[PDB]
Design an enzyme around this catalytic site. Sequence first.
Site, PDB file in Angstrom:
ATOM      1  N   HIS E  31       0.817  -1.211   0.000  1.00 55.29           N
ATOM      2  CA  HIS E  31       0.000   0.000   0.000  1.00 55.29           C
ATOM      3  C   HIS E  31       0.853   1.264   0.000  1.00 55.29           C
ATOM      4  N   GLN E  32       2.133   1.151   0.359  1.00 51.81           N
ATOM      5  CA  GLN E  32       3.086   2.244   0.204  1.00 51.81           C
ATOM      6  C   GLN E  32       3.903   2.158  -1.082  1.00 51.81           C
TER       7      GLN E  32
END
Lengths: 109, 98, 293, 49, 189, 305
Positions: E31-32
């Site tokens: 998600h990063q």
Amino acid sequence: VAQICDEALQYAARLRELEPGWSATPGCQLHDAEQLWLDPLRAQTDETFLQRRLRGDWPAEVGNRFANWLNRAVSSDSQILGSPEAAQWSQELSKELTMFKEILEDERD
Amino acid sequence: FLWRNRVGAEAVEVRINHIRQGEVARAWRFDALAIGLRDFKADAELDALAELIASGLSGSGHVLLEVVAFARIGDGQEVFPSQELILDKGDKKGQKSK
Amino acid sequence: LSTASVLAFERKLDPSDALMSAGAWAQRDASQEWPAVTVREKSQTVDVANLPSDADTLKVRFTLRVLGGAGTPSACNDAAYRDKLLQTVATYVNDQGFAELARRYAHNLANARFLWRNRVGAEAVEVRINHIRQGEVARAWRFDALAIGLRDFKADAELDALAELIASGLSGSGHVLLEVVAFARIGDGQEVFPSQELKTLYSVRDAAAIHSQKIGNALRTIDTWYPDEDGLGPIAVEPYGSVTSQGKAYRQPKQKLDFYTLLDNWVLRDEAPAVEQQHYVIANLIRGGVFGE
Amino acid sequence: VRGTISNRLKTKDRDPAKLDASIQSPNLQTVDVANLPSDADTLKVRFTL
Amino acid sequence: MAMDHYLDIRLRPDPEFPPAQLMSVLFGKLHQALVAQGGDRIGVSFPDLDESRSRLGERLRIHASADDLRALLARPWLEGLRDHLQFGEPAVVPHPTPYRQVSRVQAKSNPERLRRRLMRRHDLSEEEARKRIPDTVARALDLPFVTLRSQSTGQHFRLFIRHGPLQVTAEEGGFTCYGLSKGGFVPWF
Amino acid sequence: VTDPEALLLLPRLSIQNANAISSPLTWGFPSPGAFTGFVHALQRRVGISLDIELDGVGIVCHRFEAQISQPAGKRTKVFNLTRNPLNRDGSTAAIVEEGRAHLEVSLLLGVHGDGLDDHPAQEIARQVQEQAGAMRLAGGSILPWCNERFPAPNAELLMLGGSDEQRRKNQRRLTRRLLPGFALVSREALLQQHLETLRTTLPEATTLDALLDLCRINFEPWQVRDKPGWLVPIPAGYNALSPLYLPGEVRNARDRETPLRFVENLFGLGEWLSPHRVAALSDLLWYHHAEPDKGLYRWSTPRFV
């Protein structure tokens, strides 16, 4: 001595019917591990990991309790094993511990 | 008398006093890095203390001592006080092992 | 012939429990005033190791020293066993020095493994160390960025003297103190965890800290030669040496190369293993334990 | 507290093997003690007669 | 489904702990990776999961297209794991593309989110929220993920993993900034 | 006369209003021949349609009271009675005394049948268990199903077929549901060698069990002698002294198509054992046999050890 262990098994069987409420309560610290053979009813408050405190299938310290009872039954002296039945008392205690391990191999389970 | 706290330690030194009254009568400053633990060799300041407790063990003028050790062990190391016989009243938490 | 019934060893490499605080990068010069990571209950209540925005880095004070004398048993029962274990370990060391063990413990000091979840995801780590026998310092130290390694290991023309001073202290030729700290600029809003109680995290007073046995784990990852493989890396040394991460009994007890299986054949029947099985042997000989029957 | 066997063992059986054997069997003894506070150096005893 | 590149990944063994929090940290790092910079020329999924096993895996495949995934998986954005691990290498995709990919799929069936809205708007007691919330609409789930390091609840919980349509055709739909699937095919075998 | 194809246990056979005396010389637990007749009648009303065969029984005797009372603190006991109905003259009846007890038992049997050969397992076990609670066993009706039904459905535990270690764990998978009782087995060889060993005074045979329900001691010239268990006489068969007869020869039989023999009682002793102290559970069955060449109509436990 095997008949005395069988009488202890009969005492466990007699305790295995008169326990409607078997769970944690005031006075259950030694009975948290002592409740292995005296398996109380399945606790509703347990989660999906209910096999650790209310479903403990660990009857290996029952061998420790049998060892404590054998050590506290008769005081084994330091020079009462010159014949083949003095260390044979320890061999009979090991046979009783093996019978207790076979009996409590499926106590909480 | 420091059983395990002596060994491993870098430098130790011992303050022994004699108590006549609520005061200090005579001082003693030692160092166990210059005396052994295997040989008991004659020394120059503590033979007077030996005669002190020799008069004390004969009764001829009593002696109250304050043996105090200063053991450099390391900042935040693990000292060793003694260990009790433990009764089985504890659960899985509550100081059951030692 | 049987070995001793009761048998034990004092632990060497005795560490301190590492209290934590935050701080400033390029303030290693006077790192003395920093406030800790103060634990707060707030609502299930949880535990967040929060770090300030004017000090994003970390500070982990603990120390390390050496008892020395691995040949001497703590409490060995018999008398025809001590006199051969003394010469066994002594003529081990004079036969082959434990300089490779000194290297590997210097490699455990070299990487910042003693902070488990607290390691991962920082800017850069710089493990410090210092040579101490009294209150003043003897030879200061700095580590590198490339020479950290998560599993890798390498020796240097500055780290070798540290390796052999750990060797000579563990030999018995001058015991010294080490005081360990490792940088981590890991971030604001990172819940980077020390060890925890039986979710209660281990709170040495008005701070948070790690236990000393768990901080001993990541200073004893030595055992490379478990007979399955060694491509995953060495493990922390103990008999029946296994971990919860693998969850499998490495050093499976059905071959001669166990600790308990070759040690009674290496004192009595003289079964000598290789060099890098004997570093495992002496490496969990310097963790102690209740041994014998 | 624990200690070693300082009993005068009766020499109908006073053998070295049992003396070595009776050491790894300790003495499970919890006793009581009465010390001063360490901030004090006197003992006061009061009663009525 | 549409990738023209890829990258291999598999963490090494260690002493510390199992892959539950490692899978949660991998989901946060994904998600990063897709989210923390923005970009649609990439894939993301855990195709080494066990939905019939209740685990996450011991390998990972976070790859992308040719021009997208030719300069993405060689930086410290997923760093901290380059000493006891290893990343992949530049290789081509296959001639038949496995058109499928797993993204953030899960549910909420508790009385604190839905019953939270029904008590912060309806404002009544547990009677109406117990009569309108049975025990046979949703329960605890077991996704293709693990407990993640997010300090809103202490003990670890169910991860976020759920598959979709497993095709063999090409998916010529450019994905969003998450690396997930919206209806087409991504690189996931 | 063989160890079974499969065992069959019935865990709380709670029965009621039993016969206590069962013989002119004892009053406690009833005769084992009552249980062998119980399973012959069960075999008659089941195994002629379901094709099994029952030979031996297994007593475990969980709990046992008796309607007995102590008169004025004497060293004896009495019986509680039931009111007979009114006589034809209508003053009072000829009151007659008998002991009536309320015991608990669980019976394991021995099967030579097709319970898992051509029929399924718990179908046979469930139909036999459901059909067993419609008949009396010792002159007393079985207390039927109640809250004790909750452990009452059973397996049909095989013995003759299986792994050896699982033969062990199946018979002690049957022992785990049998703890607080005490099983009854005979001591036939102990009868023999305990009358023959103790023949240093007289050779009498009926004085064996007549000299065991008591504290034998030849005391100090306080040390109670080594009791080997629970020495207690049991009715151990039926000696038919007079010869055979016919339905037309001696009238007032029950059926007039079966012969009549006047019979007398026989006393062995039966020890009480915990089920843990056995060789195997197939080694404790009370069988049945009749030797009409003799008078001995005697039941037995072959191979009790």
